[PDB]
Amino acid sequence: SELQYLGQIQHILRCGVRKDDRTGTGTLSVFGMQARYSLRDEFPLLTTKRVFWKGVLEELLWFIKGSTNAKELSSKGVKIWDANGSRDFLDSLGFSTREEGDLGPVYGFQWRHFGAEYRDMESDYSGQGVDQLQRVIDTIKTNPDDRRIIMCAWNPRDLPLMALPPCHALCQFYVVNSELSCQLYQRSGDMGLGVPFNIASYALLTYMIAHITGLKPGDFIHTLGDAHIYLNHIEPLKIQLQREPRPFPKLRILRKVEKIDDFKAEDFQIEGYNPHPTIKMEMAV
Amino acid sequence: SELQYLGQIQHILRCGVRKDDRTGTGTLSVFGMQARYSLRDEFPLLTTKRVFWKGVLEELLWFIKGSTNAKELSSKGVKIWDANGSRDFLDSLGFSTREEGDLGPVYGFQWRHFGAEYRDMESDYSGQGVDQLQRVIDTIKTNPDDRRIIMCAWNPRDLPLMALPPCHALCQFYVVNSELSCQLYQRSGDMGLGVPFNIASYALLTYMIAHITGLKPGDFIHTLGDAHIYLNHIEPLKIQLQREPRPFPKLRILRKVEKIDDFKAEDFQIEGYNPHPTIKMEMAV
Numbered sequence: 392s393e394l395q396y397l398g399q400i401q402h403i404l405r406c407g408v409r410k411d412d413r414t415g416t417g418t419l420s421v422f423g424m425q426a427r428y429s430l431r432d433e434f435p436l437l438t439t440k441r442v443f444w445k446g447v448l449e450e451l452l453w454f455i456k457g458s459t460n461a462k463e464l465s466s467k468g469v470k471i472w473d474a475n476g477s478r479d480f481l482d483s484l485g486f487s488t489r490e491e492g493d494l495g496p497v498y499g500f501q502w503r504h505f506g507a508e509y510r511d512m513e514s515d516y517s518g519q520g521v522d523q524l525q526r527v528i529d530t531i532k533t534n535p536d537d538r539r540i541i542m543c544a545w546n547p548r549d550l551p552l553m554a555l556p557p558c559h560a561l562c563q564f565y566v567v568n569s570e571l572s573c574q575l576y577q578r579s580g581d582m583g584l585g586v587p588f589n590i591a592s593y594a595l596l597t598y599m600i601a602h603i604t605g606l607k608p609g610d611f612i613h614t615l616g617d618a619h620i621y622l623n624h625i626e627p628l629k630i631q632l633q634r635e636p637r638p639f640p641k642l643r644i645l646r647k648v649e650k651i652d653d654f655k656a657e658d659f660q661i662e663g664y665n666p667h668p669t670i671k672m673e674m675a676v
Numbered sequence: 677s678e679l680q681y682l683g684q685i686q687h688i689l690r691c692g693v694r695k696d697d698r699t700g701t702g703t704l705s706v707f708g709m710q711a712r713y714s715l716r717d718e719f720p721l722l723t724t725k726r727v728f729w730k731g732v733l734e735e736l737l738w739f740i741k742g743s744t745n746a747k748e749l750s751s752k753g754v755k756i757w758d759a760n761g762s763r764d765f766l767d768s769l770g771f772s773t774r775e776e777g778d779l780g781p782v783y784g785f786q787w788r789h790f791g792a793e794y795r796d797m798e799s800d801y802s803g804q805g806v807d808q809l810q811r812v813i814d815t816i817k818t819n820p821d822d823r824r825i826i827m828c829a830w831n832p833r834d835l836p837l838m839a840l841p842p843c844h845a846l847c848q849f850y851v852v853n854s855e856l857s858c859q860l861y862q863r864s865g866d867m868g869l870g871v872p873f874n875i876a877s878y879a880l881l882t883y884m885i886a887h888i889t890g891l892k893p894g895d896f897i898h899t900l901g902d903a904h905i906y907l908n909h910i911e912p913l914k915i916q917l918q919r920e921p922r923p924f925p926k927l928r929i930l931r932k933v934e935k936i937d938d939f940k941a942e943d944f945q946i947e948g949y950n951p952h953p954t955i956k957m958e959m960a961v
């Protein structure tokens with residue numbers, strides 16, 4: 392339920408410790424958290440504040456396509472990766488010869504081409520690397536009892552080439568009683584911005600795979616490493632914490648899709664989403 | 677084979693007529709020309725001057741992508757369409773409300789969405805209009821004897837909205853004895869600047885389609901309408917006419933590609949290209 396996220400917010404504000412970070416703003420940090428969100432007949436889209444649903448959907452399709460180019464996501468009206476792909480950010484990391492928008496071997500590259508040699512965002516990687524996403528789907532179809540259905544985005548070899556190392560670094564799938572469940576290990580959680588995106592993102596991915604594999608969505612287990620609240624998010628989150636949460640919406644898939652690459656943005660519809668007003672929170676770059 | 681291009685240059689300088697034009701610089705003009713460039717075991721990339729092959733390749737991928745945004749091609753390091761997409765140029769055509777880089781319904785829009793109503797360069801046109809490029813490839817696969825395999829970019833209805841109406845306006849494909857040939861009708865030919873680009877551009881496109889349909893490249897027939905030499909190109913072309921042509925290079929495709937949209941710039945490799953020094957020639961805007 393949504394009260395778990397609000398309970399995590401309240402715990403960090405009350406029991407978190409001051410901690411510096413890569414950005415300039417400090418954080419209130421707590422290490423080690425877990426929450427369980429039901430995917431059964433509902434979709435975990437937060438109601439205590441309006442969540443950018445098109446950003447969640449377009450970013451996930453952008454992941455599935457294997458793209459590491461922020462221009463392709465920004466052309467869909469979703470600018471969440473424009474900052475980490477800007478010219479100044481890439482220059483601050485030493486990527487002086489890299490084209491703007493090239494985030495490096497990140498989520499999209501590691502999901503579909505783990506092990507391939509990364510050249511640039513415009514290179515052809517077809518046939519190179521491990522296709523973790525498809526092997527996950529095939530293992531679910533052929534062996535639901537397998538305890539190794541894992542898609543890992545943390546590539547220690549490719550870390551120096553990434554503009555931002557993967558925050559949701561590893562996820563595992565689990566099948567029992569015709570239910571598909573998903574657990575995600577998030578090494579770093581921006582509780583105000585990224586965490587609501589990531590919870591809705593991997594719930595959507597579980598809905599996609601369950602739709603293809605003929606399973607029913609079960610639980611989404613959100614495991615956090617450094618769950619932190621930025622200082623410039625303390626007052627906005629204190630406002631969100633005073634809002635009464637409303638029932639979760641529902642996710643309807645409008646057509647029968649066979650391959651995860653065939654999913655289009657027009658195939659999904661969120662029903663019954665009545666959130667509180669949107670709360671603007673700045674990104675720490 | 678290259679001697680045909682040089683013969684046309686020499687023919688325009690010797691028998692061309694003085695003619696004004698839309699730009700400021702005059703021209704030496706000749707109406708009605710034809711040349712045949714063999715694509716068998718060679719690629720017609722001119723040797724009497726170094727041709728910007730990266731510009732030729734990136735522009736075609738930009739055409740296939742259906743883009744009409746000069747900014748998207750310019751971000752690849754190819755500024756050949758930046759002039760006709762500038763703010764001052766669009767204002768001189770009355771396009772005071774157009775965004776910069778929006779060339780209007782041009783090659784990329786007409787190849788993939790012929791008949792759709794053009795909004796702007798960033799609008800989604802997927803599913804709208806006639807996909808001439810794909811219908812060409814499908815017709816070749818299913819009926820090579822068809823005499824209607826044509827991709828036409830000249831749309832009289834969309835002409836007032838174009839920053840520059842298509843110069844290579846119509847192309848036709850032809851299959852016999854498992855050989856794919858292509859003819860281009862170019863209504864207007866900048867013999868010094870655009871024509872060497874256009875010849876290599878449509879030769880590369882024929883290599884792409886033959887690779888997709890499993891055919892061998894045959895001939896490229898270059899038909900010119902208003903073949904003109906700009907005044908500020910007379911001395912540069914007189915220098916090029918003194919250089920001995922060298923054997924054509926070869927074009928190798930590095931992987932088996934199934935759909936023409938999957939082609940990336942890394943999949944192509946020019947081998948044996950030993951051109952004469954580069955000859956700078958200004959563009960007439």
Ligand SMILES: Nc1nc(O)c2c(Cc3ccc(C(=O)N[C@@H](CCC(=O)O)C(=O)O)cc3)c[nH]c2n1
Nearest residue numbers: 443470471581584585586588670671672674675676
């Ligand atoms: N410190 C930090 N925190 C993050 O959450 C991220 C992300 C992922 C992400 C997730 C959401 C947003 C975001 O700006 N969301 C907006 C939606 C509207 C918008 O895109 O402007 C919001 O809810 O206020 C931006 C980035 C990528 N990089 C991040 N760096």
Ligand SMILES: Nc1nc(O)c2c(Cc3ccc(C(=O)N[C@@H](CCC(=O)O)C(=O)O)cc3)c[nH]c2n1
Nearest residue numbers: 728755756760866869870873955956957959960961
């Ligand atoms: N008068 C006129 N002539 C043209 O050739 C065009 C074009 C297509 C085109 C083709 C090639 C170039 C061009 O600058 N080519 C250069 C490459 C190096 C460069 O970027 O200057 C060359 O081969 O010398 C520029 C524009 C678009 N608009 C044009 N208008």
Ligand SMILES: O=c1ccn([C@H]2C[C@H](O)[C@@H](COP(=O)(O)O)O2)c(=O)[nH]1
Nearest residue numbers: 413556558559579580581585586589
């Ligand atoms: O999907 C994402 C992307 C980014 N972040 C946040 C977590 C951090 O606040 C910041 C990245 O900082 P590093 O931990 O890499 O220093 O981005 C997320 O929570 N989820």
Ligand SMILES: O=c1ccn([C@H]2C[C@H](O)[C@@H](COP(=O)(O)O)O2)c(=O)[nH]1
Nearest residue numbers: 698841843844864865866870871874
């Ligand atoms: O692929 C191309 C694009 C442009 N041009 C040149 C021909 C003309 O010199 C100019 C277009 O001007 P108008 O013909 O519309 O005046 O561009 C070419 O030769 N090939």
